[PDB]
């Protein structure tokens, strides 16, 4: 049944909403972002509502479609995510490891725009597999 494919697309969209939450906080706090292996990590199950050590993560669609990413060591930074595979969003290339915060043509807003555009084809597939 399609609920497994909805869960799969929900795993992408949950992680993209975690990224957007970190970006919206950075925009609010006047902060630049570090996205490489020294930055924020996306393996922690509490990002997806499961408790610390809760064995529901072991079968969860969120941990499954993120441990099984071609950049995963056991950890996964935002860049290891934003450079990884496979995904139904496809994936970006050429992304720089830090973005500063600056007053005109602000790099974090250009980054937020870049993430937002590729998130829209994922929202189309979520609208689809939520309405089916």
């Amino acid at each position: 049944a399609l609920l497994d494919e909805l869960k799969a697309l929900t795993a992408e969209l949950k992680v993209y909403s975690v990224i957007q939450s970190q970006i919206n906080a950075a925009l609010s706090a006047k902060q630049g972002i570090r996205i490489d292996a020294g930055g924020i990590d996306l393996v922690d199950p509490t990002l997806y509502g499961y408790a610390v050590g809760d064995p529901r993560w072991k079968d969860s669609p969120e941990y499954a479609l993120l441990s099984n990413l071609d950049t995963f060591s056991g950890k996964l930074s935002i860049k290891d995510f934003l450079s990884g595979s496979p995904k139904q969003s496809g994936e970006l290339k050429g992304l720089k490891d830090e973005y500063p915060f600056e007053k005109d043509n602000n790099p974090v807003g250009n980054f937020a725009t870049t993430v937002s555009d590729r998130s829209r084809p994922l929202n189309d597939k979520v609208n689809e597999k939520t309405t089916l």
Partner: antibody
Amino acid sequence: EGQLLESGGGLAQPGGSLRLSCTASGFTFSKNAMNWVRQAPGKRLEWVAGIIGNGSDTYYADSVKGRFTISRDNSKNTVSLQMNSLRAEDSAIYYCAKDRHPWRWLQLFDSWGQGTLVTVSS
Amino acid sequence: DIQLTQSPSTVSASLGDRVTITCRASQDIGSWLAWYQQKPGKAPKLLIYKASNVESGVPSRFSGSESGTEFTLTISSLQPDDVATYFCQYYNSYSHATVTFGPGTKVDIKR
């Protein structure tokens, strides 16, 4: 089979800055990608291997972390210390590698570069 | 990641000889494996493949076997090229390095 071929096999000044290159033959970036391995002088020391996890993805121990901010292309795939204080410990041989597969189809291609040196001397 | 040690190996008796080189792992993943070969003054090369599901092995003179916390390379027709060797893997299915390779042990081919 596919080919790799480096350039800039010369010189830098200690605490200065440096930029190497690839020129990967007909390469189109994919699921499999390129990565940069630091052959140490003579002996294969432990923490050496597997810098740049995938294309532009910076990764190492803290001993170089933040220096290795690689650029992009479809062929130049450039390891780089452009403002980033090249140390005596960073004199080594830097190899392109590619994530090969067996099974006779595409990606079964000999996968290591010709090994660009880096001299440091004042 | 997993630390490794590689031993033993010595000179062949001849061309066409048999030698078996082992390694020990400080930590576990299963049999996620490959061997790299370093001819002198050259780019390194790749040897063995297939994971904990030990599907079919390697063409020509190469072979290897694993259990517990050890893995091993047997060469059954040891040739004059075959003069340094190493172990590796990183976690998904193939390529890269264990942040260290398994640090190798000399090989040489006799007259």
